[PDB]
Scaffold this active site. Structure first.
Site, PDB file in Angstrom:
ATOM      1  N   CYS B 136       0.734  -1.078   0.058  1.00 31.70           N
ATOM      2  CA  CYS B 136      -0.010  -0.122   0.022  1.00 31.70           C
ATOM      3  C   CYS B 136       0.837   1.440  -0.125  1.00 31.70           C
ATOM      4  CB  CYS B 136      -0.925   0.110   1.357  1.00 31.70           C
ATOM      5  SG  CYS B 136      -1.713  -1.525   1.207  1.00 31.70           S
ATOM      6  N   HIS B 269      -2.703   7.691   3.153  1.00 31.53           N
ATOM      7  CA  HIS B 269      -3.488   6.238   2.552  1.00 31.53           C
ATOM      8  C   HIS B 269      -4.848   5.916   2.951  1.00 31.53           C
ATOM      9  CE1 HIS B 269      -3.993   2.450   0.925  1.00 31.53           C
ATOM     10  NE2 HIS B 269      -4.045   1.641   2.072  1.00 31.53           N
TER      11      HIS B 269
END
EC number: 2.3.1.230
Lengths: 280, 348
Positions: B136, B269
């Site tokens: 990620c 994120h």
């Protein structure tokens, strides 16, 4: 980039394959997985360099194997660098993976990052436990299994070259690919197939590429990877793991600088990185 | 009467673009028919209302949309292909599907990755191809790699690519498939010709304590139907406070010699609203200093950050001369934070 210590752990089981790109290479057997050999290889390098696992600032991994990585043979991601961090106890370390990169290219990129970030103890590991990959029975190509641990100290001063293969300069070398297994029936089946078309001139073209790239650093002795059995004693070759014996030989001879050259079967090029060595 | 100090080159974030799949999927889409345990609280908790899935039937894959986005960005930024010194790509799904005209006959594959193939497709004849993986947080890693290369004078133009075709690893018999989605992002970093833009500092660290929680594993469906074939599936089995992302931001701010109040905006994120809220408060960011973008896109792994950064720029929330912080976590687990001095960033 300074090499503080090198560690290597290869399976004793050798398997021979015939073909222009064949040879006798180590191969993991049964349910063996990569961490069984990677961890002792790392601990060997850490012990040699008098570095504790806590002191590791960075871990970068290279492993194509799609399974047989850790205790749970079915796990493929995240890459083996993270399990390694856990068993080592390298709680200060940053972990990532450079996938299908060559070791030379990885050492160059890592030297850049690690020096720029002020790291002092960096761990670059290459390993394979390829039970999950079918070999190229037509050409004989297959990955050598084992583990290589390079404990490094960055300097930011490493030089890099990405050179062409020797031989006919107009020849379009067919690269390596690993297609996915389309008919997987059991979790234990191979997940991919090694495909490197039979090219009888490739082993020498790679060797010629090594010699050409080494010409850019004529004052340096150099070490290499041997992915093919052709022209080799007994047909044996350890792929990237050949570097361990050559590096250690350079250590016994008290060399302080070296050129390490890799072969990239995916890009069909050779890549070299200049290195420093630690004495005794 | 003294010697001169060497100076790292400044890193300019020159341009950025994203490419999302054309088709969107609602939470009530038939794709989730085989999914059990779907409560209204589940949807609200994760903050995902729509999501994107690549449609290979119409030429949507991890490679085709990258070519489109890359070619779009290269033309918009007036960047010659042969002027790109390095190409850094990331794709969290171990399975790739398309190699364009480079390897036309090659379909589903584990290797090679994208960098070398894409460079040949795009004509980046001088570009060093690299394929990194941090799941990620791969976009932050690729900026970090590109920045260090530029700083030390080993590259003047670096092309960064993140392409997440995660839908091919989703087990649609499990509710784990309801969160993640596909998407592409492309960014161009160059040597700064002035002080407008620079990566002031960054901090990366990892913790493997909870490695086995989020993994890619070869297994059967969680709730199979009929003759079940083994596949590579995203697997989330395990039995906590989000502090490492704030830790990464504190470290990065300290290296840059700044504090949270010196930062004009934040880009996180997009795993879930309550995690973004935790990260923000852990560093002192107020709600109006960041966005939640998972609502219409889902969790696009490494693309959530660059997509959120793009929307922030496009919507005027991030302006030239702003100092921003980009941060996030990733399976492994890893954590990255970056303190950016931004200039004019071309959105395209």
């Amino acid at each position: 980039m300074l090499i503080q210590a090198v560690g290597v752990n290869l399976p004793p089981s050798y398997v021979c394959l015939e073909g222009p790109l064949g040879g006798e290479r180590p191969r993991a057997q049964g349910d063996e997985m990569l961490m069984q050999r990677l961890l002792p290889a790392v601990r060997e390098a850490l012990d040699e360099a008098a570095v504790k696992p806590e002191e590791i600032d960075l871990i970068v991994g290279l492993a194509l194997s799609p399974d047989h990585l850790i205790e749970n043979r079915d796990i493929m991601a995240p890459k083996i660098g993270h399990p390694l961090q856990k068993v080592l106890g390298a709680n200060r370390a940053h972990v990532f993976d450079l996938t299908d990169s060559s070791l030379a290219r990885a050492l160059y990129v890592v030297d850049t990052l690690a020096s720029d970030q002020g790291y002092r103890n960096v761990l670059v590991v290459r390993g394979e436990s390829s039970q999950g990959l079918e070999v190229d029975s037509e050409s004989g190509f297959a990955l050598a299994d084992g583990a290589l641990a390079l404990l490094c100290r960055p300097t930011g001063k490493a030089a890099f070259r990405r050179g062409a293969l020797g031989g006919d300069p107009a020849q379009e070398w067919l690269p390596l690919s690993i297609p996915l297994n389309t008919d997987i029936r059991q979790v234990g089946d191979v997940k991919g197939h090694l495909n490197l078309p039979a090219q009888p001139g490739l082993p020498e073209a790679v060797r010629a590429g090594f010699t050409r790239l080494a010409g850019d650093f004529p004052q340096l002795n150099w070490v290499r990877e041997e992915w093919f059995g052709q022209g080799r004693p007994d047909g044996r070759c350890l792929g990237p793991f050949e570097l361990a014996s050559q590096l250690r030989a350079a250590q016994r001879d008290r060399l302080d600088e070296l050129l390490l050259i890799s072969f990239d079967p995916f890009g069909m090029v050779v890549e070299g990185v200049t290195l420093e060595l630690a004495g005794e | 009467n003294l010697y001169f100090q060497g100076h790292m080159h400044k890193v300019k974030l020159a341009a950025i673009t994203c490419e999302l799949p054309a088709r969107s999927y609602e939470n009530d889409d038939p794709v989730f028919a085989a999914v059990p345990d779907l409560s209204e609280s589940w949807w609200q908790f994760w903050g995902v209302n729509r999501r994107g899935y690549f449609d290979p039937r119409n030429g949507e894959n991890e490679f085709s949309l990258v070519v489109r986005a890359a070619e779009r960005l290269l033309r918009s930024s007036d960047t010659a292909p042969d002027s790109v010194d390095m190409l850094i790509c990331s794709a969290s799904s171990p399975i790739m599907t398309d190699a364009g005209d480079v390897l036309p006959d090659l379909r589903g594959r584990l290797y090679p990755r994208m960098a070398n193939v894409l460079s040949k497709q795009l004509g980046l004849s001088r570009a060093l191809p690299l394929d990194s993986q941090m799941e990620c947080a791969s976009f932050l890693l690729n900026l970090r790699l590109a920045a260090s290369m530029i700083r030390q004078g080993k590259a003047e133009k670096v092309l960064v690519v993140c392409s997440e075709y995660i839908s091919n690893l989703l087990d649609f018999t499990s509710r784990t498939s309801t969160l993640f989605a596909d998407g592409c992002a492309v960014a161009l970093l160059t040597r700064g010709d002035d002080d407008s833009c620079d990566l002031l500092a960054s901090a990366e660290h990892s913790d493997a304590t909870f490695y086995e929680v989020a993994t890619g594993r070869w297994r059967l469906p969680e709730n199979p139907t009929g003759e079940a074939k083994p596949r590579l599936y995203f697997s989330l089995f395990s039995d906590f406070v989000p502090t490492n992302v704030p830790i990464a931001m504190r470290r990065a701010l300290e290296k840059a010699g700044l504090g949270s109040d010196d930062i004009d905006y934040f880009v996180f994120h997009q795993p879930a609203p309550f995690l973004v809220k935790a990260w923000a408060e852990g560093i002192g960011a107020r709600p109006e200093q960041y966005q939640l973008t998972m609502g219409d896109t889902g969790v696009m792994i490494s693309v959530s950050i660059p997509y959120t950064l793009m929307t922030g720029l496009r919507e005027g929330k991030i302006r030239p001369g702003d100092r921003i912080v980009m941060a996030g976590a990733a399976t492994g687990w890893g954590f990255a934070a970056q303190v950016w001095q931004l200039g004019e960033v071309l959105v395209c």
